[PDB]
Amino acid sequence: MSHYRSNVRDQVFNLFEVLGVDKALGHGEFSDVDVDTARDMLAEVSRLAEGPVAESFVEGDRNPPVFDPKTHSVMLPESFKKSVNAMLEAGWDKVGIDEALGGMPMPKAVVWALHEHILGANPAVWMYAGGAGFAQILYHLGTEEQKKWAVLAAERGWGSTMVLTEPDAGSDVGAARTKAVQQADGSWHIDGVKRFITSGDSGDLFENIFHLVLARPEGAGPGTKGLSLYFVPKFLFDVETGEPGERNGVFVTNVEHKMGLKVSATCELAFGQHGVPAKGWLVGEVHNGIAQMFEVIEQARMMVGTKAIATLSTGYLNALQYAKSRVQGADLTQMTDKTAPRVTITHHPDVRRSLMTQKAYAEGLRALYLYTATFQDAAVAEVVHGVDAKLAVKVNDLMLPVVKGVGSEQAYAKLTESLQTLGGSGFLQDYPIEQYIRDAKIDSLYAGTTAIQAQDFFFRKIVRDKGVALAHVSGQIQEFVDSGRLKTERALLAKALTDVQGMAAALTGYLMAAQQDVTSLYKVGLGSVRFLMSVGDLIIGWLLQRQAAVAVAALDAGATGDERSFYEGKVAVASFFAKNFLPLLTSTREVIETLDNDIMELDEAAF
Amino acid sequence: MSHYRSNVRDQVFNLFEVLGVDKALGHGEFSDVDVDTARDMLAEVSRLAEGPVAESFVEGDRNPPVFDPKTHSVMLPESFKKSVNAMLEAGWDKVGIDEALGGMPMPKAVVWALHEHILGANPAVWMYAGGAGFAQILYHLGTEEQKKWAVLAAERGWGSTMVLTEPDAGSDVGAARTKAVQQADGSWHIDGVKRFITSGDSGDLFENIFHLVLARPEGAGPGTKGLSLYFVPKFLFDVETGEPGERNGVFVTNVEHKMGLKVSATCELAFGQHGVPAKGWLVGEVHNGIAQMFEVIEQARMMVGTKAIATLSTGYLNALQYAKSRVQGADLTQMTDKTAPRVTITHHPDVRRSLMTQKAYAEGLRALYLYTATFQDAAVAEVVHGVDAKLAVKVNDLMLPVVKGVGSEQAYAKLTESLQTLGGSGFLQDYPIEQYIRDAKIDSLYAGTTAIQAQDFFFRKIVRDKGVALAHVSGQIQEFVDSGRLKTERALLAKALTDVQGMAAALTGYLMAAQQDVTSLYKVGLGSVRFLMSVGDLIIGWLLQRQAAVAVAALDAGATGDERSFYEGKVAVASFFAKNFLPLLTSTREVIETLDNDIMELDEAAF
Numbered sequence A, B: 001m002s003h004y005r006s007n008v009r010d011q012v013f014n015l016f017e018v019l020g021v022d023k024a025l026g027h028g029e030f031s032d033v034d035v036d037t038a039r040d041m042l043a044e045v046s047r048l049a050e051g052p053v054a055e056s057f058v059e060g061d062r063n064p065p066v067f068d069p070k071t072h073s074v075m076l077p078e079s080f081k082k083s084v085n086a087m088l089e090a091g092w093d094k095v096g097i098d099e100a101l102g103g104m105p106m107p108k109a110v111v112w113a114l115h116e117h118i119l120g121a122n123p124a125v126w127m128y129a130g131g132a133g134f135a136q137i138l139y140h141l142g143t144e145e146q147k148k149w150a151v152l153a154a155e156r157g158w159g160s161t162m163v164l165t166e167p168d169a170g171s172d173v174g175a176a177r178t179k180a181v182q183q184a185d186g187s188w189h190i191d192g193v194k195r196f197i198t199s200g201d202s203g204d205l206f207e208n209i210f211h212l213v214l215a216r217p218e219g220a221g222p223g224t225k226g227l228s229l230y231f232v233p234k235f236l237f238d239v240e241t242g243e244p245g246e247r248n249g250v251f252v253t254n255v256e257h258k259m260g261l262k263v264s265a266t267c268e269l270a271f272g273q274h275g276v277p278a279k280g281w282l283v284g285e286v287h288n289g290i291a292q293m294f295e296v297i298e299q300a301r302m303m304v305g306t307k308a309i310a311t312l313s314t315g316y317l318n319a320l321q322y323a324k325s326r327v328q329g330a331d332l333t334q335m336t337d338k339t340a341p342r343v344t345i346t347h348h349p350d351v352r353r354s355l356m357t358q359k360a361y362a363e364g365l366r367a368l369y370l371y372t373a374t375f376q377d378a379a380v381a382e383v384v385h386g387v388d389a390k391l392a393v394k395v396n397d398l399m400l401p402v403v404k405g406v407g408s409e410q411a412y413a414k415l416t417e418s419l420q421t422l423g424g425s426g427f428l429q430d431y432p433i434e435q436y437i438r439d440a441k442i443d444s445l446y447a448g449t450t451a452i453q454a455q456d457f458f459f460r461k462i463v464r465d466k467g468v469a470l471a472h473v474s475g476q477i478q479e480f481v482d483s484g485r486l487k488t489e490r491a492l493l494a495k496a497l498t499d500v501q502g503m504a505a506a507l508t509g510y511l512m513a514a515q516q517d518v519t520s521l522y523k524v525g526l527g528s529v530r531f532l533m534s535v536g537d538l539i540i541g542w543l544l545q546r547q548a549a550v551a552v553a554a555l556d557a558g559a560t561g562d563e564r565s566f567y568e569g570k571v572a573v574a575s576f577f578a579k580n581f582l583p584l585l586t587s588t589r590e591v592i593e594t595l596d597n598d599i600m601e602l603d604e605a606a607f
């Protein structure tokens, strides 16, 4: 087969044995979707991922897109084009999207499980083909006239981009200087240069591209609150039929050469700099740019974390496959006997430690993004968690920085173990883990760096939230921990919950203290990322133990064969994680409780 | 200037203010080298590394060597060949080499500090140019006839290789099947295929290459003990003048395609398979192969750890230079004020945490390999540490797994922080950190995987050694923590010593219990790598506090200006490491004390 190894069985286990998404199927907007329908779609898309989508994964990296400056055009490998069009011709880009746009209803938890397979097999495909998902947001936020455009965009299959960054405005989006001047007809003319734009051009892959652009109206206020969101197409088009017309003044002027994700054209995109106006329209005809754009960012941050996790999972499964078959060395128990038979390396304790660590974070993080996705539909959140719509929004907001920040960083860190499992062969392009690592590095940077995720998590999702969402998740873990074979694991989780609550209390103390000495805030920043990562380990631990309980019940009821091996692996991985990673949170709490500002007051030249 | 950023000042600090190498200079073999001569040499190689050597760093990766299968030859980029020849013409490969081979005396601590700059600027240069260091080993081990061959190899500038690995014999060197058949004329015919041979061919870069080859003499016993070391030249040569002659029967048949270190040709090397016998000569005319080859392996393991550390250093320095000039966002104390002045990112807490983390491991690991190198000369070890020659060998042996294993893994892990400091630009090939990471990942694999290092460290360097070397080093740390501003840090180091000593006790306990239940050994394997990493952190913490003590003295003695900034940085980094990384060892100890065999008993199919 291909490089991509899927795990539909684990997705089904989470969705329909552990998390309860099955109880929302057959109800609400999912009247005509049952568990069998969702299972079949998952198997169907996993086969597409493993075949036509994965087929161009290697070539996308080895023969990157070619950029021609004078026609401002990017040419993608033909094999990649077919991969994208194989996905689109099957309609996987439209599941969960409004029926007006050609979609059919589906819980986001299932949608993200479906898209996991695409993100694992060839993530850039998902990016180039996000047009309809972009159209969904434009449909939600636009005037009635702009809704017809969104409908057209979805059906003519346009490509799409999210356009915020400028050389001087990356983390600080509010510093952007791309400007917008209103025209007599109500149109606007966009004028500026944007940097690092994913899918900024894609050649003849699509009939059109509609950029969603942040720009500052002439005379607008400063910062992010002064930015407005604009619909700017590559081609002007017939507002009735969608037929592309005159080329609009939006041009790629450069394409970055990157560590990985090479098939995703990361572009310098110029608006109105080449003699042709960049005509655009104010989304919703209101000035509400940063709020509007964050509907896109929220999806971007979910995708990026799910991508990081999809990559770890297939990285782990490739390493496991290799390890079962690689003979090297003798069993440690027969070390003195140098004539002892050679064994497969899964017999070596460090290889099993490595593989169980990979397993725990692949499956642990899979559970985490699926659990997060059960809060992204109010109806699913209601039936699974018994929370009302407002609280579900708060919990999803709480969990997004965890999915993105912990997923990106832990996936990359544990792909190191995947590669280590192959020995020297892991350093070769013959195996895909090398590329997995290069493609995954980006996940801690774009859609907001980890430091921005951790700042958002504490200041916006806990402090501004008054801790409500965190107290809800904490309370669910408390109940789980207070409720035979899993008693030791639950006590380690009780300790980890207490450790994380002590982290949050210390950081809130630093926050409170800042009223007397404002530099106390630096301590919060110093601890923010370790706190973010600790919460992730806590929720991974809990979800894995919820899985282990379902597995114990399945084994007692007489599981046999492959199902028994699946459930046996869940008991072991939940216990392994509890004993090897949860106790580390104790030392981290002590460090966070002890933070000082020595390194803040240090002279910069001392570094 | 170039990508490579050096730190001569820190090397001097370690060598001549902390570690006491100055006491050995001016005496014994080092008559002709004083502190000043060494500082100038470090500065001189500093500049060669930054210029002619770093010149080809980028091209070597983006235009890798071309393999010609019909002539079994590798063609290296011309600019890279210039870099190698610039190193050789300045004689940096012969520093510390026997005078018979064109070298002059130099303590190993200074030699590795010299080579740090080549390894950071273009590590493959060091590898290709290592021929003279190979000859020194040939000179030590050879018959009188072979020592003349070693002289000619050093004088004619030949390249060299170390040839062990086969497809079925990587970590398990003893499974190699390359054969050796003695001829009437006293030579042997080598027959087999070797894999992954660094520098297996180099085109016209050198006049000859002498391969050091492990092979199994006809009728020898199994495992590493049945292997012998053979001298196998690319060209047969006149044994009096060294003039190359007939082509010997050893040919490269493939070159690997790798993640990084691309300009190092990693070759499939075939002996006696292309119709021409591969003539070789038994090194020392004795069958001591694995012990002889381990003289080479010990240098390779020191180099790999030093390379990884050299790479983290220039990664940190590049990120630091970038952080000081990158304007993004405002001070955290003004987060509510959206009009606040923009600041350089060095003002942000998470960036300073990141930078101080990179600093502590770059400088901590530099101290580690320099400390280790003070045991690689008997005269130096006596003057500096007061230990006899045989104990110095044992300590060096103890530390080689630390330098290679901990250096390789921690350098790669912390380069993630370096790249993160660049934000989105770190993912660009426009900056060198992307290449650092790819070039560094191999450090955890070749010259023995991290698991091999951890196994060697415990079973051979602690258990076979009867705790002598470990007891000596721990004794020095015990002394140190029992000796105002460094008091808090001293106590954290004491706790770390107790923690590591508890890890050792637990592992020794598991070893003893293997007398009754031999599976207990598996627990040793499970904790082996974490134990090794913990010792690294202990020794890093210790050395940084030794540096801090020296720095405090210099501060109170009236240091000013840039020297004051240097010394202040050492105080801060030693304290930061003590407070943020040493306490984490307590939880690691608890994990090691609670290891069990559940994941060993688990069915393979359950993974």
Ligand SMILES: CCCCCCCCCCCCCCCCCC(=O)SCCNC(=O)CCNC(=O)[C@H](O)C(C)(C)COP(=O)(O)OP(=O)(O)OC[C@H]1O[C@@H](n2cnc3c(N)ncnc32)[C@H](O)[C@@H]1OP(=O)(O)O
Binding pocket: A096, A097, A098, A127, A130, A132, A133, A134, A136, A137, A162, A164, A165, A170, A171, A172, A173, A174, A198, A223, A224, A225, A290, A291, A294, A296, A297, A298, A299, A300, A303, A446, A447, A448, A449, A452, A456, A460, B338
């Ligand atoms: C049915 C089907 C469904 C289909 C749809 C799904 C599919 C769609 C397809 C997805 C496409 C993905 C394509 C891939 C492209 C790659 C992504 C990128 O790199 S792209 C680029 C990625 N770039 C980045 O990620 C930017 C990174 N930088 C940051 O995030 C900064 O922290 C900053 C810019 C927010 C700071 O600015 P500063 O002015 O200090 O900010 P303040 O703190 O003052 O907040 C101001 C206002 O912002 C707002 N708002 C804020 N936070 C949140 C939130 N978390 N959350 C929400 N809103 C949030 C809020 O309105 C707030 O006002 P208020 O409510 O308070 O009144």
Ligand SMILES: CCCCCCCCCCCCCCCCCC(=O)SCCNC(=O)CCNC(=O)[C@H](O)C(C)(C)COP(=O)(O)OP(=O)(O)OC[C@H]1O[C@@H](n2cnc3c(N)ncnc32)[C@H](O)[C@@H]1OP(=O)(O)O
Binding pocket: A338, B092, B093, B094, B095, B096, B097, B111, B127, B129, B130, B131, B132, B133, B134, B162, B164, B170, B171, B172, B173, B174, B198, B223, B224, B225, B290, B291, B294, B296, B297, B298, B299, B300, B303, B446, B447, B448, B449, B452, B456, B460
């Ligand atoms: C100015 C100078 C400028 C230029 C400088 C040039 C310097 C020189 C060249 C530098 C290198 C060039 C760069 C090349 C980079 C490629 C490096 C590689 O990958 S290639 C290398 C890649 N491949 C590897 O690294 C192999 C990795 N695999 C291993 O290490 C395995 O553990 C194994 C082979 C030892 C197992 O086999 P098994 O038979 O079960 O192991 P046992 O436990 O039973 O010991 C058997 C005998 O071996 C001995 N001996 C053992 N250990 C050590 C030691 N630490 N320590 C010492 N000796 C050791 C010992 O004699 C022992 O006998 P005994 O004393 O006990 O009676």
Ligand SMILES: Cc1cc2nc3c(=O)[nH]c(=O)nc-3n(C[C@H](O)[C@H](O)[C@H](O)COP(=O)(O)OP(=O)(O)OC[C@H]3O[C@@H](n4cnc5c(N)ncnc54)[C@H](O)[C@@H]3O)c2cc1C
Binding pocket: A161, A162, A163, A164, A165, A167, A169, A170, A171, A172, A195, A196, A197, A198, A199, A258, A261, A266, A442, A445, A446, A447, A448, A449, A450, A451, A452, B326, B327, B328, B329, B330, B345, B348, B349, B350, B351, B420, B421, B422, B423, B424, B425, B427
């Ligand atoms: C491959 C790729 C594709 C991209 N595609 C897109 C796209 O389609 N659309 C788009 O809009 N953007 C895109 N970007 C940009 C992306 O959104 C990133 O947010 C951007 O690269 C980050 O800003 P920067 O690179 O200027 O880094 P900076 O913001 O300059 O960050 C540099 C360092 O400073 C730290 N830092 C910065 N500000 C703070 C702060 N206030 N507190 C603490 N630490 C801070 C960061 O964490 C980081 O370590 C892409 C980037 C890449 C690499």
Ligand SMILES: Cc1cc2nc3c(=O)[nH]c(=O)nc-3n(C[C@H](O)[C@H](O)[C@H](O)COP(=O)(O)OP(=O)(O)OC[C@H]3O[C@@H](n4cnc5c(N)ncnc54)[C@H](O)[C@@H]3O)c2cc1C
Binding pocket: A326, A327, A328, A329, A330, A345, A348, A349, A350, A351, A420, A421, A422, A423, A424, A425, A427, B161, B162, B163, B164, B165, B167, B169, B170, B171, B172, B195, B196, B197, B198, B199, B261, B266, B442, B445, B446, B447, B448, B449, B450, B451, B452, B455
């Ligand atoms: C770039 C590069 C250059 C190289 N250059 C040279 C060279 O010049 N000369 C040379 O002789 N070799 C060279 N090698 C070979 C290199 O030393 C081997 O790849 C290395 O020893 C690992 O062997 P392997 O690839 O077969 O992995 P394996 O031995 O198959 O290891 C696979 C996995 O099993 C684990 N494992 C194996 N045995 C054990 C055990 N007993 N206990 C616990 N875990 C175990 C490993 O840690 C790893 O995770 C090079 C390799 C590379 C990648």
